[PDB]
């Protein structure tokens, strides 16, 4: 069938009219920031949140920067924590590009969203960001830390979009390998899971749908320069064996119909199912990649967030019984 | 890619099956009912609900039996109404086969679910059921009727699975033609939308996925014997023009990955998008058709109901929005 995009996503697809691969990453990031600040709709209907900037200090003196958002009037309430990893191909993206998505998730889920400002590539390479994210989850799951930011570590979930979905997936595999049972759910929004740039979705949507093959290649080349390293399952979790993926957290995998990453996201969901996990995998029709890193939120983006919230609410209900509490 | 079914759906798919197309419909129905009753789990973990049975007297002297379920302690609370059309290929299905699904929707959405026991085929043909379902929606939307069963007609949504998805869709189109503005949303769960038995999903899942191409042909044969009538958009709404499908109610279209009807459901969603409607279309991976007409509810079935409920709540909020 021929893809019929929804109006918003069509608009975005045609709007993308500049090659970021021709510029240095700092320039691209500054242009991105400007495109958010200069969007006249960027602040319209933006929910109000209580925001806190938090630094966690590692052993040697290094820092992980966390941005924590929560609904207003939750000052003495303990909330479920959502540790969020943003997309941007490991090279761009920020609390600003994902402000819309994060503020909406915060007030719809009534959760503390813990946004990890991880180190971007190429200034660092794989696996530095991954280790920062794992360290952030480990920090949040620790009882005294969770008390300090009024969240309930028994409801911790990881969530992320695109390259952030990759990070969510592999942080889960990694925590499993360290014998930790601290992540209760993973939400993967059109994740990067492999480096095969000739899957059918890659062929069909290689150009003119905002996220391009060219851009994916550029991202991978900055993140993992030496191609052999791409064989690590912590880079490309689709290459993992079924046994590698057993006993992972309850998962929601969301894919876009018109997206180069569609096939690998759906194949990763099939592998998670083979491995006996609790997996919900859904493809949304008529949308493209990138609806969650913009100044505004498409109608379908909003439906998707309502879905994610319903699923999170079920996840937390599952926990609450058999009690913790 | 090769389809990976989830365990529950795999087991359902692998099960010992009898060719229903070899038996008369009435026998199929009694056997179906028996299949629900003799399941020891059909009643275990079933939500408790307040149930009321209501008869509609149609203008032509025939009756529609309505089964209305709402949550306990809601006798004197006004609730949103969901008018529900069950699946079964227009030939089978009942308040019993969908009891599990309906009770769960009832307590999860905390809504009044109005289950239409419409007349089955071949005892009647197209379009008798469609006419009954439309009359049921008009009845609920009528203010004194809505007040009598404590529902808020400003939130009326239609919902249906399979052939019941078909009915939901076309009821909307019919209501549009009659200039009625009483449906605020439509939920189409892997709906029948066309009669092309040779789409890609029909070919790929023709056998061994519970719902078969054989069974669909049998269904269409009982529902619409005279093939000329299959050209009606009220039989196959996929055949409607884009202009025909304009300004329909806000829609949620859910398809199953391993299902013969997958392609036409998704094609109908694309047409609804082309026509400028508010449409959410989702394909759930690793499942088959028919998870909503059984004694139990699969894990994915449960997730899907949670999805629908979230979507319904957004629908109900959008409708009440201007009251501010």
CB contact under 8 A, B269 and A283: no
Strands B157-161 and B112-117: unpaired
The residue annotated as part of the active site, out of A86, A222, A289, A298, is A289
B269 contacts in chain A (CB < 8 Å): 285-286
- Judge whether B267 is closer than 8 Å to chain A, CB to CB: yes
- Cα of B316 to nearest chain A Cα, Å: 13
Q: Is residue A83 within 8 Å of residue A159, measured between CB atoms?
A: yes
Nearest partner of A203 among A264, A117, A244, A152, judged by Cα: A264
Contact B1 A267 (CB under 8 A): yes
Letter string b/e over residues B112-138, b meaning 16 or more CB atoms within 10 A of that residue's CB: bbbbbbbbbbeebbbbbbbbbbbbbbb
Instruction: State whether residue B10 sits within 8 Å of chain A by CB.
Output: no
Are B314 and A306 in contact (CB < 8 Å)? Answer: yes
| Rg over CA atoms, chain B | 18
DSSP element (H, E) containing A205: none
Distance, in Å, from the CA atom of A83 to the CA atom of A184, rounded to the nearest integer, reads 11
Strands A279-288, B49-57: pairing kind = unpaired
* Distance, CA of A126 to CA of A107 (rounded, Å): 33
What's the gap in Å between the CA of B56 and the closest CA on chain A?
35
Quick one: which of B247, B3, B275, B286 has its CA closest to A286?
B275
Mutation site, B306, B312, B324, interface A, largest A CB count within 10 A? B306
Residue range A1-325 in CATH 3.40.190.80: no
Residue B62 backbone class (left: φ over 0; alpha: ψ -120 to 50; beta: rest): beta
State the nearest Cα–Cα gap between A265 and chain B, in angstroms: 11
Q: A77 is written with which tokens?
A: 């309430």
DSSP string, A207-229: SSSSS-HHHHHHHHHHH--SGGG
Cβ separation A282–B280 shorter than 8 A? no
The distance in angstroms from the start CA to the end CA of chain A is 50
Cβ of residue A123 closer than 8 Å to a chain B Cβ: no
CB B318 within 8 A of CB A319: no
Pick left, alpha or beta for residue A33 (phi over 0 → left; psi -120 to 50 → alpha; otherwise beta): alpha
Neighboring chain B residues of A321 at a CB cutoff of 8 Å: none
First to last CA, chain B: 49
Q: Alpha-carbon Rg of chain A, whole angstroms?
A: 18
The DSSP-derived string for A88-103 is STTTS--TTTTHHHHH
Nearest C-alpha neighbor of B321 from the set B188, B150, B187, B184: B184
SS (H, E, C) A1-68: CCCCCCHHHHHHHHHCCCCHHHCCHHHHHHHHHHHHHCCCCCCCCCCCEEEEEEEEECCCCCEEEEEE
> Are A230 and A236 contacting, i.e. CB atoms less than 8 angstroms apart?
yes
SS (H, E, C) chain B: CCCCCCHHHHHHHHCCCCCHHHCCHHHHHHHHHHHHHCCCCCCCCCCCEEEEEEEEECCCCCEEEEEEEEECCCCCCCECEEEEECCCCCCCCCCCCCHHHHHHHHHHHCCEEEEEECCCCCCCCCCHHHHHHHHHHHHHHCHHHHHHCCECHHHCEEEEECHHHHHHHHHHHHHHHCCCCCCCCEEEECCCCCCCCCCHHHHHCCCCCCCCHHHHHHHHHHHCCCHHHHHCCCCCHHHCCCHHHCCCCCEEEEEEEECCCHHHHHHHHHHHHHCCCCEEEEEEEEEECCCCCCCCCCHHHHHHHHHHHHHHHHHHHHHCCCCC
Tokens 């749908």 identify what position?
Answer: A209
Distance, CA of B162 to CA of A14 (rounded, Å): 36
d(CA A264, CA A282): 13
B284 to chain A: nearest residue by CA?
A282
CB contact under 8 Å between A313 and B306, yes or no, is yes
CA B107 from centre of chain: 18
The CATH homologous superfamily for domain B1-324 is: Alpha/Beta hydrolase fold, catalytic domain (3.40.50.1820)
Taking the mean position of all CA atoms in its chain, how far away is CA B135? 16
For B183-200, b/e burial (b = at least 16 CB within 10 A) is bbbbbbbbbbbbbeeebe
Q: How far is CA B253 from CA A196, A298, B186, B194, in A?
A: 31, 18, 8, 15
Is residue A121 classed as helix, strand or coil in its secondary structure? coil
Q: Catalytic: A298?
A: no
Taking the C-alpha atoms of residue B109 and residue B168, their distance in angstroms, rounded to an integer, is 18
CA–CA gap between residue B79 and residue A164 (Å, rounded)? 40
**Any chain B CB within 8 A of the CB of A285?**
yes
Q: Does the active-site annotation cover B259? A: yes
- The count of CB pairs under 8 A between chains A and B is 80
Nearest chain B residue to A201 by CA: give it. B1
Whether omega before B108 lies within 30 degrees of 0, making that bond cis, reads no
| B309 contact residues in A (CB cutoff 8 A) | 310
Q: Calculate the dihedral angle through the C-alpha atoms of A124, A180, A115, A227, rounding to the nearest 10 degrees.
A: 30
As a whole number of angstroms, the distance between CA A106 and CA A74 comes to 12
Q: Is there a contact between B287 and B255 (Cβ–Cβ < 8 Å)?
A: no
Give the method used.
X-ray
* Interchain CB contact of A44 with B (< 8 Å): no
Pair of tokens at residue B30: 């009694």
The catalytically annotated residue of B20, B94, B121, B162 is B162
**Pick from B270, B309, B310: CB nearest A4:** B270
- In chain A, residues with a C-beta closer than 8 Å to the C-beta of B266 are 1, 285
Chain B: residue nearest A299 by CA? B278
Q: Which residues have a Cβ under 8 Å from the Cβ of A151 and sit 6 or more positions away?
A: A78, A79, A80, A81, A112, A114, A140
Which residue is associated with the tokens 């915060």? A106
Q: Using a CB-CB distance cutoff of 8 angstroms, which residues of chain A are in contact with residue B254?
A: none
3 state SS of A83:
strand
Give the ranges where A43-196 is alpha helix by DSSP (H). 99-109, 128-141, 143-148, 163-177
Contacts of A4 in chain B (CB under 8 A): 270, 273-274
Smallest Cβ–Cβ distance between A266 and the set B273, B278, B285 belongs to B285
Q: From CA A219, how far away is CA A46, in angstroms rounded? A: 30
Q: Rounded to whole angstroms, how far apart are CA atoms A235 and A294?
A: 25
Active site residue B39: no
* Of A1, A286, A311, Cβ closest to residue B281: A286
Specify the DSSP class assigned to residue A256.
Answer: E
Q: How far apart are CA A110 and CA A94, in angstroms?
A: 22
- Burial annotation B42-61 (CB, 10 A radius, 16+ → b, else e): beeeeeebeeeeeebeeeee
Q: Cα separation of A191 and A160, whole Å?
A: 8
Distance from CA of B284 to the nearest CA of A (A): 5
Nearest chain A CA: its distance from B306 CA (Å): 6
- Among B162, B190, B164, CA closest to B82: B164
**C-beta pairs of B15-18 under 8 Å, 24+ apart in sequence:** B15/B210, B17/B210
Chain B residues in contact with A269 by the CB 8 A cut-off are 285-286
């Amino acid at each position: 069938p021929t893809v019929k995009l929804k109006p918003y996503c069509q608009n975005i697809a045609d709007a993308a009219t500049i090659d970021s691969t021709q510029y240095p990453p700092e320039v691209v990031r500054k242009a991105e920031a400007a495109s958010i600040i200069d969007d006249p709709k960027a602040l319209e209907g933006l929910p109000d949140v209580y925001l806190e900037e938090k630094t966690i200090n590692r052993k040697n003196g290094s820092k992980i920067e966390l941005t924590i958002t929560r609904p207003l009037d939750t000052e003495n309430q303990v909330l479920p924590p959502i540790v969020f990893f943003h997309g941007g191909g490991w090279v761009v993206g920020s609390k600003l590009t994902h402000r819309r998505t994060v503020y909406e998730l915060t007030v719809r889920a009534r959760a503390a969203v813990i946004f990890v400002n991880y180190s971007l590539s190429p200034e660092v390479r794989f696996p530095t960001a991954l280790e920062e994210c794992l360290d952030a989850v480990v920090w949040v799951a620790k009882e005294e830390n969770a008390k300090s930011i009024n969240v309930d570590p028994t409801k911790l979930v990881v969530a992320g979009d695109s390259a952030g979905g990759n990070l969510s997936a592999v942080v889960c595999i990694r925590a499993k390998q360290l014998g930790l049972n601290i992540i209760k759910g993973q939400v993967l929004i059109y994740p990067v899971t492999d480096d095969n740039f000739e899957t059918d979705s890659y062929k069909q949507f290689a150009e003119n749908y905002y996220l391009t093959r060219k851009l994916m290649v550029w991202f991978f080349d900055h993140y993992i320069p030496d191609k052999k390293d791409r064989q690590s399952i912590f880079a490309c979790p689709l290459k993992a064996s079924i046994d590698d993926l057993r006993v992972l957290p309850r998962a929601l995998v969301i894919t876009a119909e018109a997206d180069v990453l569609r096939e690998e996201g759906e194949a990763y969901a099939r592998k998670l199912i083979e491995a006996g996990n609790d997996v919900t995998a859904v493809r949304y029709l008529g949308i493209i990649h990138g609806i969650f890193n913009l100044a505004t939120l498409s109608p379908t983006g909003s439906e998707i967030l309502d879905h994610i919230v319903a699923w999170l609410q079920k996840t937390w209900k599952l926990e609450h019984h058999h009690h913790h509490h």
